[PDB]
Design a protein around this ligand. Sequence first.
Ligand SMILES: Nc1ncnc2c1ncn2[C@@H]1O[C@@H](COP(=O)(O)OC(=O)c2ccccc2O)[C@@H](O)[C@H]1O
Ligand SMILES: [Mg+2]
Length: 537
Amino acid sequence: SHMLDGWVPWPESFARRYRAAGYWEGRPLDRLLRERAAADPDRIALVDAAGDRWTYAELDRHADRQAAGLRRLGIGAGDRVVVQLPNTDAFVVLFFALLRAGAVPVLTLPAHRESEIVHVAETAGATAYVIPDVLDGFDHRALARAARKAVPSIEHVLVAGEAAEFTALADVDAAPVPLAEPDPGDVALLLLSGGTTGKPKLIPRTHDDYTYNVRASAEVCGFDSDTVYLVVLPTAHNFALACPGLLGTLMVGGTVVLAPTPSPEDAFELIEREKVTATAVVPPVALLWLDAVEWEDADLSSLRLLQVGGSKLGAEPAARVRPALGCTLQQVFGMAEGLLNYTRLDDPSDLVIQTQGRPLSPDDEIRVVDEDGRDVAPGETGELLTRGPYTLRGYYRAPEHNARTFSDDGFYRTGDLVRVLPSGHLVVEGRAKDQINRGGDKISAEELENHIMAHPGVHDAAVVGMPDATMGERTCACLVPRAGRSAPAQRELAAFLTDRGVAAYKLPDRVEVMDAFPRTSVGKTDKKELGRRIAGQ
Ligand SMILES: Nc1ncnc2c1ncn2[C@@H]1O[C@@H](COP(=O)(O)OC(=O)c2ccccc2O)[C@@H](O)[C@H]1O
Ligand SMILES: [Mg+2]
């Protein structure tokens, strides 16, 4: 018996192995903060961009007071709560307060707009939605009004700022009350997957498997109480939350520093001010920092570890990390769905430069298969399938996609093309899945294509990735015009999609109009040949 339905537990034989192995320790996720605050109450746990500062005892107490405040509002025991917050202390407090209240955080990104928020809110049956007031020029309270209109289950809107007619997040506060602990085998939080279908899919992560993800990652990356970690990616990104991210830093007793943006302006200042020792970035930001040290004066010497992942970092800039930034590079090839691959900190530089790591867990199982599902020969390229103690067995409330995406014996089809080296390290070679990787931001083609086809001048749309030297891929929208109507150009389509509620990183970089798409012999749109036509071949 589980608190939520709609997810796929591990078979009992696997659960037993993972507990017997010490991977699944049987502790709720919020207990990482409870135990650290008990052992190191007066250590500095959290620093925000302004310079404000909180000890472990202070953070633990505020999480209890906000958890009691959430319960007074009726948020708790299994309720799903959509969280959309910037890199501020409000996110860290509320994350633990929701866990202690028994609520299941549904983590979204600040860039997400009405179509993503409404979909995840109604899929999760969320009862509350947590937003900033105004963030980067956008008023999220209008979005909460639109979300509540489309999703009647949303009873409460909690606002980090001026709350308007809603509830101020700072007012969610009451005297701590004894709260029951969740079952560690239950879902702890729901992550948003980059997606390969028409709708974003939610990833359930349990207390046991997410704690192991965090704990094992902190060991591999050498996180301990000396670690000062700069959160450069959104706090809701799996990389910055758990790999080892801020949760790993808190679990071991280090200091979390919240960066408002990844710009050298904000990040380099915080690295010098707080003596940051570790951070994680996507490759486009790595390239920016590697350039920017040539004209920025910040003292970055305290930096010891730069994690780079989300897309493949080139071997040439990888080799520049030590001379330019004075720290160790760690390549990270991971996914919200589970499997994490890390280069080890003392790997020879050859493997740090040329590979995307080897799996985190001894019980991470990998297969590399050809187009027929058969295992490839050693060192051949094929699609990565994986199964392990923190990889999901199914998405949340997505039975049809689960039937397509997981093998009969529980292997998750990643859609990534890789080859495995004799040492066990992986090299990422490409992608099979119909999803564009734009600077670490994942764009489901079919989701974007369906939005574009809602435009009155568009009959059919095919979204195709184009190579980009610094961004990895950019997005080309190939359009068949509506009969007797003109298709829109790039700027009009961007405005249409933005008004529709599509996140800005999904807006096509380029529009190409054509009378028909090339098709295969089954009749599916041939995007390999669309790429050729886009390039004038
Ligand atoms: N170093 C890399 N080199 C080439 N490709 C990479 C890659 N790292 C990710 N990818 C692609 O991203 C994934 C889905 O993305 P994600 O779910 O958003 O999570 C993350 O990126 C993420 C990244 C690091 C740590 C924790 C995470 O969670 C994969 O499937 C693959 O396509
Ligand atoms: Mg250094």
